[PDB]
Symmetry: D3
Subunit: 151 residues, 6 copies
């Protein structure tokens, strides 16, 4: 259960608006363990592969273009319930519905500029992590605080 | 889109040093400040502000309180700003407000609930005209508009 | 009533993780008045007395061992609706249900590591205050801001 | 004197970068009293009048063009030693010399993008206040906290 | 190493809601809280606290003020905590304090300078004994000790 | 001048103590542009190479062991004066001498646990960047805020 991992990505607008550190700090304060991190501008092919499930949609080309338009920050977080906690920390995908206190609630207005992405399930997270990161990019370490955060 | 809302920091919010906190939360959200001022409402401005309540109990006490010290008046511009503004402020009654909102974090009593935000586009347009002349509203474009808005 | 009081404790994990000041600051910002404050490591007996309503539960021995494992910070806060508002500020007791913006929503993952405790009712608060503090440990004072926070 | 006043402006870059609330909050936290506040885009003439002491400098035309390029937030703050303390809060006027903890130290890099302005003396403050505000725009009020901030 | 310092939030710092802010800055720095209490000093405690000033002007006024409302007393433990504590609080006279410190961020007047910290190990040991019994000081080990201290 | 880059590394203690996001946010707020980022546990050989200049010192083996004991976060920041501004943001290398408002001033006590490293000069920064990052790891992008931050 505490081996669970989620994928979080700061989208190009989140990077442009200087929100990378804020997002990372919110996960660290929550007690989650950072195990992979990188910044990169997705290529068209990376953006297409990430949005594979949407490749039949009319807005797919626009999405792909936007997602590959500048750098994103890719992250993997580890810990008990991290997939669900990650979605709760980010807030509702549509910022009009997000609560203050969450990342979208505090910072975002439009669904197309919603700052960050997080995995929607453990199964999606496994796919996302392996898509963006090679095995040798994932750090294996133990937090000195683990017995303070987890039963 | 060019939707605007009116936000006031009430006399207790000014007295408690909350003006900057409230402005910062709107800026962080990506909204655009287009008008700003501090003043102590006259009796007449307070009666005008509360005109809808003139037949409700304790109207003179409300008028006296709202005119007792300075308020800060603001106008914010952006997509869904009226609804988002109310969400940012939190429930009008602080006992029902959620932590993370202004009333959720800073208020306890409805009578001292720190701030006011317009409840609809129609009310916003009325409140903005009531408190500001046209020439006090700034026309400008945020350099971040394409990062915030689709 | 303006003179309502509640008991809040930062549990041993909250003290270990350096959350004491953060918790106190959130109650001060809300407009509540601090009237009692101390740090101590509960004895087994004090922990059992604290959790006496749970004495028939299978998780009682673990709760007691953990609560007596290290220092807690005990507090009493005063003001209108402080019991209910205290609980709201701390967030759902199981952090999996807690909302960001609350202490458990921002900082906690596991229910046995839920950082803090707040009385669950006025009746419970009266019991907990009397359990942890003598009458002469409670400060009687008037906040200069009282007429700005309360009508 | 407790009634000393200073002029602070958030410059067009500070407004663009969403620093207005942050600046106001730092003056409120310090214990100073806000007595005047407005947002406007300076005309060329207002910018030249503001920088009139610099009218012989080669960088004057650039300073004027920049100051009149977009909205500023004008403020007057009141309290003991507010002119000097204002300058200290904003930090060294050249951000390369500013210390972290100050507005320019935390937020600015370039001197032509130094986020804000504060009067450099009581004489300058009196001039700047009169330049930007009519007497009837200045609020006279008493902070409930005055006896907690001043002896 | 096991060096300890005494920090008090003075009556103005408690009245202005600064207790949590001050505690948080010591926690963040990596220091260990070992004693904590709130009380309104009696006349006698205030005279004891200011004993070194009993022959200086306006001593009775200082005594009256320090005994006028609650203070928060704390003891912090760690390497260089006496010196680091004073640096964290900032210059005693707020006009000389730097932004980033407690007095730099929150105080204006030396007479209302929010907090007090021991100026030496010898003074700390005296102040700690004055305000706390031995059994009020907690003995514990921070789980983070090896991350903070060489 | 605005092409200047510096290398910043959160040391193992900074990562263990949950300070990665805080550090990143302080650079973002200052107006600097993040262009490379990664988390990894240095190998012994990486730690030895990073500390090459110290390889003759008696404390070198201890330093190498500590630096390779857990993950660090490597970063490159870009912008005018970033090397000097980075050192100013971090504070004095010895935390006993660091000012509140800086990273060491706020968070660190001991020189051996001083949270973060930053390049001491433009020449050192070039070496550090190339040591830790390949050319294809450095993102080339333009901040939408560049004309707000820089003259």
């Amino acid at each position: 259960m505490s081996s669970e991992r989620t994928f979080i990505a700061v989208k190009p607008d989140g990077v442009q608006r200087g929100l990378v550190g804020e997002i990372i700090a919110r996960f660290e304060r929550k007690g989650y363990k950072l195990v992979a991190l990188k910044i990169l501008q997705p290529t068209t092919e990376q953006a297409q592969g990430h949005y594979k499930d949407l490749c039949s949609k009319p807005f797919f080309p626009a999405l792909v273009k936007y997602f590959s338009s500048g750098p994103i920050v890719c992250m993997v977080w580890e810990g008990k319930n991290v997939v669900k906690s990650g979605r709760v920390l980010l807030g509702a995908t549509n910022p009009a519905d997000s609560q203050p206190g969450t990342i979208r609630g505090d910072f975002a207005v439009d669904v197309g500029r919603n700052v960050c992405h997080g995995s929607d399930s453990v199964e999606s997270a496994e796919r996302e992590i392996a898509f963006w990161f090679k095995a040798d990019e994932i750090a294996s370490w133990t937090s000195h605080s683990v017995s303070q955060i987890y039963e």
